[PDB]
Amino acid sequence: ATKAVCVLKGDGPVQGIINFEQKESNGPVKVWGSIKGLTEGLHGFHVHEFGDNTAGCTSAGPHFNPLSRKHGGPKDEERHVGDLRNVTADKDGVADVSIEDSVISLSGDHCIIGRTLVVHEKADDLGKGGNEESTKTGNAGSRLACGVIGIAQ
Amino acid sequence: ATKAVCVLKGDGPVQGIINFEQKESNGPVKVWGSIKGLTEGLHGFHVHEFGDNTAGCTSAGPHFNPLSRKHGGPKDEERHVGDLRNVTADKDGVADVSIEDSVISLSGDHCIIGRTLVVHEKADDLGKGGNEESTKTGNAGSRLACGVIGIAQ
Ligand SMILES: [Cu+2]
Ligand SMILES: [Cu+2]
Ligand SMILES: [Zn+2]
Ligand SMILES: [Zn+2]
Ligand SMILES: [Zn+2]
Ligand SMILES: [Zn+2]
Numbered sequence: 650a651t652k653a654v655c656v657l658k659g660d661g662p663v664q665g666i667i668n669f670e671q672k673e674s675n676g677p678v679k680v681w682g683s684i685k686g687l688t689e690g691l692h693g694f695h696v697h698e699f700g701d702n703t704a705g706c707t708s709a710g711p712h713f714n715p716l717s718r719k720h721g722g723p724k725d726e727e728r729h730v731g732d733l734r735n736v737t738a739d740k741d742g743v744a745d746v747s748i749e750d751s752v753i754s755l756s757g758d759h760c761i762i763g764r765t766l767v768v769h770e771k772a773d774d775l776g777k778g779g780n781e782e783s784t785k786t787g788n789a790g791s792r793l794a795c796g797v798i799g800i801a802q
Numbered sequence: 803a804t805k806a807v808c809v810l811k812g813d814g815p816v817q818g819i820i821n822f823e824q825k826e827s828n829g830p831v832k833v834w835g836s837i838k839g840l841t842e843g844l845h846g847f848h849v850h851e852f853g854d855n856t857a858g859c860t861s862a863g864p865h866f867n868p869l870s871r872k873h874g875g876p877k878d879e880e881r882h883v884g885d886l887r888n889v890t891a892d893k894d895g896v897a898d899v900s901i902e903d904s905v906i907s908l909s910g911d912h913c914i915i916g917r918t919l920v921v922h923e924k925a926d927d928l929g930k931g932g933n934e935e936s937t938k939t940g941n942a943g944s945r946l947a948c949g950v951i952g953i954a955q
Contacts, residue, residue: 653916656855666856700915700952701807703819710955762853762916763806763953797950799853800916802863 651755654801655766659706659794662686667746667766669798671755678755680733680748684768684794687738693773693789694746696731696753696798697765706792709765711785715758719784722775723750730759732787735773744768767795804908807954808919812859812947815839820899820919822951824908831908833886833901837921837947840891846926846942847899849884849906849951850918859945862918864938868911872937875928876903883912885940888926897921920948 653669665684671677697709712720713731721728730752736744753761770790778788806822818837824830837845850862865873866884874881883905889897906914923943931941 654854654856698953699955700950701954702809702952703807763951765952796855797853797952798916799855799918799950800851801854802852 652801653755653762653798655796655798657684657766657768657794657796659792661793663768663794665744665768665794668801669755674756675754677749677751678753680746680750682746684736684738684744684746685742687742687744687768689738689740689742691735691737691772692744693769693771693787694733694736695767695769695773696733696761697767698731700763700765700797702765702795702797706765706767706795709767709792709795713761713764720776720787722777723752725776728752731761731764736768762798762800764798765795766798767792769793805954806908806915806951808949808951810837810919810921810947810949812945816921816947818897818921818947821954822908827909828907830902830904831906833899833903835899837889837891837897837899838895840895840897840921840946842891842893842895844888844890844925845897845946846922846924846940847886847889848920848922848926848942849886849914850920850948851884853916853918853950855918855948855950859918859920859948862920862945862948866914866917873929873940875930876905878929881905884914884917885926889921914951915953917951918948919951920945922946
């Protein structure tokens with residue numbers, strides 16, 4: 650089994666810790682933790698290609714997408730590797746994250762260790778928003794917080 | 803060729819950006835960039851095992867050392883994978899880093915992507931200090947700044 654972790658920070662109040670665990674190669678990755686400082690409701694949540702935060706979250710590049718597929722929802726066959734389920738913040742601005750995803754991985758071609766996890770300003774429209782931008786980014790707006798995904802004990 | 807990058811931060815004083823590049827599998831890695839906010843002179847410079855910054859630099863674990871070797875100098879056959887050359891800060895507290903290291907890698911068993919780079923309070927004694935601690939950590943004192951090593955474009 651493999652574990653990873655990410656500390657999310659930004660220029661506003663959004664901050665969080667997200668854990669990843671994968672019991673076996675190509676198996677589901679469990680994703681969990683808490684993010685605070687968010688507006689109530691849904692927020693886009695993606696793995697971006699680069700673990701480069703030299704210019705903040707902007708330097709993380711696009712969604713992790715090694716086969717140049719369209720942006721989609723987590724359950725779509727046509728999705729980027731980095732297209733995780735939206736997180737949901739409650740009335741106190743807290744998202745308690747509970748995700749299982751079988752497209753991301755902690756080894757192999759879909760490995761996300763060393764890449765950037767980003768939480769967004771708005772909801773990800775899952776590629777279903779009816780404009781081209783939707784099938785590139787999900788229209789999730791700005792990058793509010795992020796961090797590089799690291800190997801954990 | 804593969805590139806990686808690391809943003810070093812701690813609690814305010816010490817800040818830096820370090821780049822990594824490796825032309826081929828098993829080949830030397832070039833390490834370069836700049837760190838500011840240091841006292842003049844030598845500072846230990848290590849890759850630690852875990853890319854876990856949940857408790858700041860403390861949660862990075864020990865030096866990256868997959869074969870349970872002794873701590874050494876970078877040119878020693880017996881060293882941890884993470885034992886890089888000390889960095890040297892000038893009289894203004896700036897270390898211009900220029901390293902070539904043949905033991906670290908950006909792929910394979912010695913891969914450091916997803917692990918933590920750490921710069922220290924004191925010089926690493928290269929495992930040639932006067933106590934048993936020397937051959938574990940190099941007696942480099944506190945972890946002044948760190949970051950997770952991420953994949954770069
Ligand atoms: Cu994103
Ligand atoms: Cu160290
Ligand atoms: Zn199985
Ligand atoms: Zn996407
Ligand atoms: Zn060669
Ligand atoms: Zn060492």
